[PDB]
Amino acid sequence: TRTIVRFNRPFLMIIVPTDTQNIFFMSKVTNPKQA
Amino acid sequence: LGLASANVDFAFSLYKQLVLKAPDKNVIFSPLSISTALAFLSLGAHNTTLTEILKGLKFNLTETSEAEIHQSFQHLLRTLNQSSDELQLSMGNAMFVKEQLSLLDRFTEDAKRLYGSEAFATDFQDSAAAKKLINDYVKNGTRGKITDLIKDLDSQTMMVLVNYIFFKAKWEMPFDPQDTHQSRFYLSKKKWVMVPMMSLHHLTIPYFRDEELSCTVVELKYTGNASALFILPDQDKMEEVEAMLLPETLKRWRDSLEFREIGELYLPKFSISRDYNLNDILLQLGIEEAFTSKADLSGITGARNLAVSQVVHKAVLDVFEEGTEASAATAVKITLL
């Protein structure tokens, strides 16, 4: 079967820079429709 | 580098705590912003009040002196404080000082060269005004995002140390808004929900799937020296995965990631905001004395009369088809003992 990535459940998101391992932002989306 | 792994370490401990608080809720905060503000504050601390913060930040003093650490922060602010063409990065530090107070020179100078802090004499006497002033500097620096940082202001507040970070970037492979549509988003094992799902097809992106942790790692790069790593744990794995959030398990993700063609990818289009009062979180992380009457902040003025009252933190994060906007601010409320 096709490799399918579907984010239909609470996921973690880590915005980090290329130029070094340091975490800029980091969120855990438990429910998108907050706003 | 090495002291970059500290910063990562401090991010995951802070996260682990924030979740203990309200696991059920979403999270969003910038770790870098917090670390810079308490490193900045640390510039004015001495003795134990100093050891603590410098240890609550996950630094290994056994191998690092306080000068090396402060230097780390200047090089880093220097390096990343620059918006490319397709990626905007902005970092700012400022110190709002009440008019009456004369602060040590060593402190005002170190603030300048090291953290690039801007000073502002303030009248913390008339709370109303002092407030707005700080809020403009933040919203100004965050291009209209952080708008309610400081909401109340002690008339006893001698000083405030602020930090903001703004991030605007685009996707290397952006979504087609024409293809964006509603789909189910599972809040839990059975409770589903309708949500605008953004979808892409036939992309070759850095993927990875490690079973020893039961989750999947996908990587989407922004047109810039920055990229977003989405971690997707399986149903009932979230707990286990947060348990393993360590500087090392991160190091692994980023090594094991190998390009691959994915047939279909689905990512919600979200926008989230969060306020935070970090006093209790800091206390758990061992940053205690600075909050106590045993506050040794003599590095600022020249006497043990200042102490920390509050450290709040606001962050916003929009994830849309075209790209990402993100932003946060940290402000330290410094009161007279």
Ligand SMILES: *[C@@H]1O[C@H](CO)[C@@H](O[C@@H]2O[C@H](CO)[C@@H](O[C@@H]3O[C@H](CO)[C@@H](O)[C@H](O)[C@@H]3O)[C@H](O)[C@H]2NC(C)=O)[C@H](O)[C@H]1NC(C)=O
């Ligand atoms: C840096 O912090 C240390 C730790 O608090 C300070 O050392 C402490 O200073 C106090 C006040 O001089 C000492 O007081 C004495 O304590 C002993 C019992 O420990 C008692 O028998 C005496 O009658 C008096 O109360 C305390 O011992 C001392 N402890 C340590 C571990 O050093 C130090 O003064 C601070 N230095 C700076 C530069 O801020």
Ligand SMILES: *[C@@H]1O[C@H](CO)[C@@H](O[C@@H]2O[C@H](CO)[C@@H](O)[C@H](O)[C@H]2NC(C)=O)[C@H](O)[C@H]1NC(C)=O
């Ligand atoms: C990071 O970059 C920003 C933008 O250049 C810096 O902000 C400027 O700082 C100078 C003083 O060094 C002020 O006089 C300018 O008015 C600020 N820019 C704007 C657009 O207002 C910031 O100081 C730099 N460094 C750090 C550590 O924040």
